[PDB]
């Protein structure tokens, strides 16, 4: 029996939801239960992105599946340049300040090639041109080497249809597109599978077909990317068991528990509750809020998405000269990172050896840079961008700040505690008040009360003895979220979930 954690894809920078899935996979491995991530969306660099976290056998992508490229590794690089000049007798004209080449047969322009690396080892795409220099076709290569997709273009480079290949060059899917509000949308998909020809109207129906081909009796599905996965599970037979996992607040306005509409990302799930064996949320409070809202229609249970180990990297090696505050959060409006920049403006006149290091990425990074310049805080507030390993950054961290107005748990909060860094967080739904005991491992403060924020951060700077005591509380609280503790809950859950 296999357990399948169904998300959408993996980017370059590991997000919360992707980390929750990989955490869950490492917990099932530790307990000996077979488990695989399932990715839906077409992504020809997915094998590169997954490389740094999971193995090739730890996941299945839907497009890889129909393209017979599941559990395939990289080929030894093909020397395209050398095959184009020596074998094809083409002429290559390098494009300056690029990894691109223009390809000609004598004086005739045929192809524009973009490589990914400056070593020309990874062909990315090739554009095909007709006698009038119309771009009729784009060839997209998988980072593993093979040609994954050809796109046929019409008019002003509009997508008309896509063809997906196995590594041998046989066609396995066809997609046909029409334009609606200036974007291409799928109107038909043809799949060649098990020597038959299947017809679908959209990617959701293809999703539902994929889930059905994966499923064997005794298998269990987990729906983690509900905006895509719920509609897919809605077109699968009830005989295939699936658990819905909520990753954040479930309603658009959390101060109206009874009345607020469900978020768009959960609508399709909440509108077909009886499809699901259960809902999992991260926190007690959200379990009780959700079980009320859905009038107990299906079981709701709380299993935190995050866990701690013991750390072999250094803990609380503080610089005795300066105070290092840290924010570990997306540069995104709900994290309200502008508030922590206001906090430093107020503190800098009192404690001038202060540093705030903000680890993350997103749209707000320009407004946040402009806010630091405005206040002349370039020496004190550092937008560090995204680091894939934070272990060294927690070593010398005095305090971690959270000014968010909505969490599902906050992996960053537990991660901080686990490295012995105490946290000062607004008391919001959900997670902070289950993870912080005021005056034990940090302080909870009323949502958006920036005065209480300043007062309490000032109190811990003034009292290095208090920071030492809260640090040790942080390691103790982290132990309540241990690997062993999460395995005990997942084991009981999996043993009770299937029908008997």
């Amino acid at each position: 029996a296999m357990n399948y954690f169904v998300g959408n894809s993996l980017g370059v920078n590991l997000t919360g939801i992707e980390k929750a899935i990989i955490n869950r996979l490492n917990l099932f491995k530790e307990m000996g239960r077979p488990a695989q991530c399932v990715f839906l969306s077409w992504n020809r660099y997915l094998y590169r992105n997954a490389q740094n976290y999971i193995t090739s056998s730890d996941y299945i992508n839907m497009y890889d599946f129909f393209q017979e490229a599941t559990y395939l590794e990289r080929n030894e690089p093909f020397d395209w340049l050398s095959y184009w000049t020596d074998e094809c007798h083409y002429t290559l004209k390098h494009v300056e300040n690029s990894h691109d080449f223009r390809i000609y047969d004598q004086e005739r322009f045929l192809m524009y090639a973009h490589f990914q690396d400056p070593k020309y080892r990874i062909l990315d795409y090739v554009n095909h041109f007709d006698s009038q220099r119309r771009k009729v076709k784009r060839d997209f290569y998988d980072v593993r080497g093979f040609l994954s997709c050809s796109r046929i273009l019409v008019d002003k480079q509009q997508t008309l249809c896509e063809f997906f290949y196995n590594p041998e060059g046989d066609t396995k899917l066809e997609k046909y597109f029409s334009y609606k509000d200036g974007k291409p949308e799928v109107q038909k998909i043809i799949v060649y599978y098990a020597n038959k020809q299947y017809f679908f109207n959209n990617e959701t129906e293809l999703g539902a077909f994929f889930i059905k081909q994966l499923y064997q009796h005794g298998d269990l599905f987990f729906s983690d990317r509900n905006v895509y996965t719920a509609p897919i599970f809605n077109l699968t037979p009830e005989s295939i068991p699936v658990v819905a996992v909520l990753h954040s607040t479930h309603i658009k306005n959390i101060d109206a528990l009874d009345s607020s509409p469900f978020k768009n990302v959960y609508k399709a799930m909440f509108e077909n509750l009886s499809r699901y064996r259960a809902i999992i949320v991260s926190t007690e409070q959200q379990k009780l809020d959700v079980e009320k809202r859905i009038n107990h229609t299906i079981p709701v249970v709380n299993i935190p998405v995050g866990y701690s180990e013991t750390i072999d990297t250094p803990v609380q090696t503080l610089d005795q000269r300066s105070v290092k505050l840290i924010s570990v959060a997306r540069y995104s409006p709900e994290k309200q990172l502008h508030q922590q920049i206001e906090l430093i403006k107020r503190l800098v006149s009192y404690v001038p050896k202060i540093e705030l290091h903000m680890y993350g990425f997103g749209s707000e990074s320009k407004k946040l840079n402009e806010l630091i310049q405005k206040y002349g805080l370039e020496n004190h507030v550092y937008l560090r961008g995204f680091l894939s390993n934070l272990d060294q950054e927690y070593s010398d961290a005095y305090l971690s700040l959270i000014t968010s107005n909505m969490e599902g748990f906050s992996l960053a909060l537990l991660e901080s505690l686990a490295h012995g860094v105490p946290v000062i967080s607004y008391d919001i739904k959900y997670g902070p008040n289950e993870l912080i005991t005021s005056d034990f491992n940090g302080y909870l403060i009323t949502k958006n009360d920036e005065d209480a924020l300043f007062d309490k951060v000032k109190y811990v700077i003034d009292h290095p003895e208090v920071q030492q005591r809260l640090s040790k509380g942080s390691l103790a609280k982290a132990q309540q979220y241990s690997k062993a503790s999460l395995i005990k809950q997942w084991d009981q859950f999996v043993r009770l979930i299937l029908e008997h």
Binding site: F109, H114, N127, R133, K135
Partner: peptide, 8 residues
């Protein structure tokens, strides 16, 4: 230039 259209 018209030539920048060749790439993406």
């Amino acid at each position: 230039s018209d030539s920048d259209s060749d790439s993406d």
